[PDB]
Write a protein that binds this ligand. Structure first.
Ligand SMILES: [Cl-]
Lengths: 413, 413, 413
């Protein structure tokens, strides 16, 4: 069965304390990967579910509260750019979508061992708070309620067509020669193009040059975007961090403030002409008019009224008229639609789960059930892959992909 | 007719300035009883409607702004625990759901005498504000936006199955022998069990021992619950107190703050797996996964989006597939469902009215009309009783029950 | 075609920098007229669209940030009361609905010239902020989140039946004799009655006597109303001003505060018995129970939940059972309904557009399309008039009316 197979991927990809996203392709600990993977471990061993998160904070979190996107636990030649490019166990210098508090809330509420639950939640609570504080300190200096990402890897959706025009401004002059390693594990046509990677590395070198100084990175990055996905996830995490606080009887401090200001911000990203949520390019000072599946994530946050949810429900159904499987990462009628190339079209299991949870909350039971059925069927037929063709259902990207197996286990719990 | 009969109960139960909930059974002034009863008096004599509330504050409200749940106006042997157990005219040392500002808002808006309206509203406004302030001072020291009740009588829903596990922790060692008086007026099978009353009194003695000190009561009570009902009622009252302020041109001070923070809090009580609002046990640090009719009360508050209201509408309809009359106080499929025993199943007229008002606001006209029709039919056939069997419609609890007659008059105005 | 004809009205009514609402009838610059008219100019010449707003601020805005309702650019005998009555280029001493930031947001987002866009938006941003600040300073001293208008011209809906009882209190003793000029350009039966104008002038003379002192005007005006229209427009403008700030990377200062407090306030105006939003009379301290088309404007603001939008959708459909064209300015079953007299029944193109945009946002596509079709058909058959008979579709009020032509061009863009 699906579940038995799912467990084996998690056990094979386990390195003891953390779980790699994929053998070789992703030989390190990733931030939002580890959060979703923790949910899967709840179906195998709770102790080890918590452990995934403890390892993430204990080895990942810097003194300023920043949680980086990769914790480079063990040497490897299989991944670029590795610790030596970042030049800092070693970690990357950027962050990823802060889905962790949401995952911590579920672990806390549902652990059968209530003494363990409380120990781990009290231990992680202030660390969560420091992470969110770093986000607003580093990425929201005008106190807007929205946070910027300074690198498209921080969205978790690396080559999303929303980032194309923002990335066009990143200078690519006199970059060191590098050899990519991802294309040894995955077909190149399924990964970002070199123009993309040149720009990904140019940003990393600007950041390393500026010594990963939050203030300077913000001032000088040629890439500054209010990602609808990162911010919807953050609004959701804030609401779950608030719940934790009240349940644990901790001082919620300024969490309420984050929530209230975040709600004004997240709903500002709505474009009434297009009937969709867009990420914003702050360098250009404009909305990025590109409908990606991150634009559904405010449903996960719970900020929209029913009428906006309705309009999103209608949009997903339209995408379903072309795509055999929901939910493709970009409008399949988009000129940028590429049904096999990463975040430019393929279906992803984690986004399916989030958007489904979201639609369920707003009463769209049939659509939420379609997203679940599509996810499970894709995984029944092609195993646990990083993403899938929305037209054909063909597995793409990483094989033995940990969060696919984790969410399969979680969603069928 | 129903209305003529309703008036007579109010006139018979009137003690001049206040109205008892029921002759003998409840021979004193109750807090949320008197608020709903005031609405009924609006259909007989407005002066006397206001008077109900004036008496409540003038004789009930302590120096710290606390409004207690019982004002022990006249000696009686018919009720236990009476003023001498509480040991403090005398009052109890605990509060009840703060529905009063909402009732004060209606009285103010609708009194045909506009000079009276303004006198009474200006007189009561600062007293209302002090009451709410006491709530946040005594019961929300971490400034969460949610307030705890420290005793299940404070919910107004004394033996709700949500309180069972919280109550299990209340020590019952070496309690004085007492004789219950409620079971002289009502069948025992319709009232709380002795295990319940032992625990109710143990909490009262801890509170009397700690001299009803808000700070110590909060720190030491073995019972600490965020009641969804108390807090939904409080959110609604806050919004109505804000309206009063603007209408009277009074400084709303921190009411906005209460409303904004309260809205974050009340919506945190939603459990997405169960599709329902739960009260929270802060001693255990967990949601209490028990669906009671208090979980519908956020509709009265107006905080949910339409999708949550939808899911609640679906839940009420399911309860209606078993129960002949809506709205039973607990899911009729609950293992704790007891169709005659107080707040563990019976239908209540005040909760019917609140939940109906709530569903009406969210567009569920048919369900709201069903709740009204059910309430009025129950009262047509069995008179004005405290609660009713949801299966058979048989009258239960107190006879000549004042808020049933009051709401009957109000709801058919 | 409609569009070609629309352009000619704007070019004929253009005085170079600003556009008059109507030749002769309205020979000056009006505040909310110029905002809607700017949207029309976007379909002809963007430079000139911006210019409309620049002229409004550069010549209109006082040192305290107040934006007045009329900028009296050029001498004329065609209008009363003109600059010499106000006694202050000259301007009036009162304001109008602050729809400007919303219009500025659209201009900014859509200007094909991105350098121009940024210049104009950065230039106008702090001026917008000062205008809103003046509103809260002058008109919200208790920091309610709602602002009062002190004169029914400030609503933009001069003789709305909601103002009748508030106006009844304005003293009309020993007023100077005046001659009205509006009735030279428009049938008197289509304009306000003399009892109205006596009261309009009495307020202007009290204000001129008190030297247009914000503090004294607020304390002494016999007319003080929380207009649902002005405040819904302001909530919408605040949300758009917030968007601008984030897009421009300007410090949003207290805009979030305005939005959060404004949302509590605007939703307090909802009357659950009537199923509608009412303006409030603060002199009487009561809701004004009169359903006008301003009561739909919270849909433009985006504050209601779907259930209130639903109830409003049902109300508009009822009004449509009597009225051949939506949306009449007052419930056609109202005893105050006058199908030709200004804001007491006629259909208006700007309110149609706003309420349609609003219903679209809440998923009421059919109703929004009806409002648009009705607007365009009214303008196809009777040209561009100030308002129209909802029963017959007959043109009323000003001829060659600028915002009708502007919105016709805009809405068919
Ligand atoms: Cl909603």
């Amino acid at each position: 069965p699906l579940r038995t197979k799912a467990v084996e991927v998690l056990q094979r990809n386990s390195r003891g304390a953390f779980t790699v996203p994929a053998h070789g392709l992703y030989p390190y600990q990733w931030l939002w990967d580890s959060a979703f993977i923790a949910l899967g471990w709840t179906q195998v061993d709770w102790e080890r579910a918590w452990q995934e998160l403890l390892c993430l904070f204990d080895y990942g979190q810097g003194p300023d509260g920043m949680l980086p996107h990769i914790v480079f636990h063990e040497q490897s030649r299989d991944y670029f750019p590795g610790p030596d490019v970042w030049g800092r166990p070693a970690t990357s210098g950027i962050t990823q979508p802060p889905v962790v508090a949401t995952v911590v809330r579920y672990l806390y509420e549902k652990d059968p061992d209530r003494d363990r639950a409380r120990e781990r939640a009290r231990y992680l609570f202030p660390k969560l708070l420091a992470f969110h504080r770093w986000l607003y300190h580093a990425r929201d200096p005008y106190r807007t309620g929205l946070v910027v990402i300074v690198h498209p890897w921080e969205s978790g959706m690396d080559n999303s067509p929303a980032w194309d025009k923002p990335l066009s401004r990143v200078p690519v002059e006199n970059l060191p020669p590098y050899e990519r390693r991802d294309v040894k594990h995955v077909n190149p046509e399924e990964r970002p193009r070199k123009e993309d990677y040149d720009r990904y590395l140019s940003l990393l070198y600007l950041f390393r040059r500026l010594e990963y100084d939050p203030r300077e990175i913000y001032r000088q990055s040629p890439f500054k975007v209010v990602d609808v996905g990162f911010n919807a996830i953050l609004q959701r995490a804030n609401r779950d961090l608030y719940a934790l606080a009240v349940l644990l009887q901790e001082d919620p401090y300024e969490i309420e403030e984050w929530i209230v200001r975040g709600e004004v911000g997240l709903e500002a990203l709505w474009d009434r002409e297009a009937g969709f949520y867009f990420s914003w390019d702050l360098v250009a000072g404009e909305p990025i008019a590109v409908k990606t599946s991150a634009g559904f994530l405010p449903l996960f946050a719970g900020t929209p009224h029913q009428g906006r949810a309705s309009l999103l429900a209608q949009e997903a159904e339209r995408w379903g008229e072309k795509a055999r499987y929901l939910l493709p990462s970009v409008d399949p009628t988009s000129p940028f639609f590429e049904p096999g190339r990463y975040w430019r079209g393929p279906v992803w299991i984690n986004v399916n789960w989030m958007v489904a949870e979201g639609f369920r909350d707003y009463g769209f039971a049939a659509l939420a059930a379609r997203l679940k059925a599509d996810a499970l069927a894709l995984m029944e037929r092609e195993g646990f892959r990083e993403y899938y063709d929305p037209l054909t259902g063909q597995g793409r990207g990483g094989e033995g992909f940990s969060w696919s197996a984790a969410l399969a286990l979680f969603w069928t719990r």
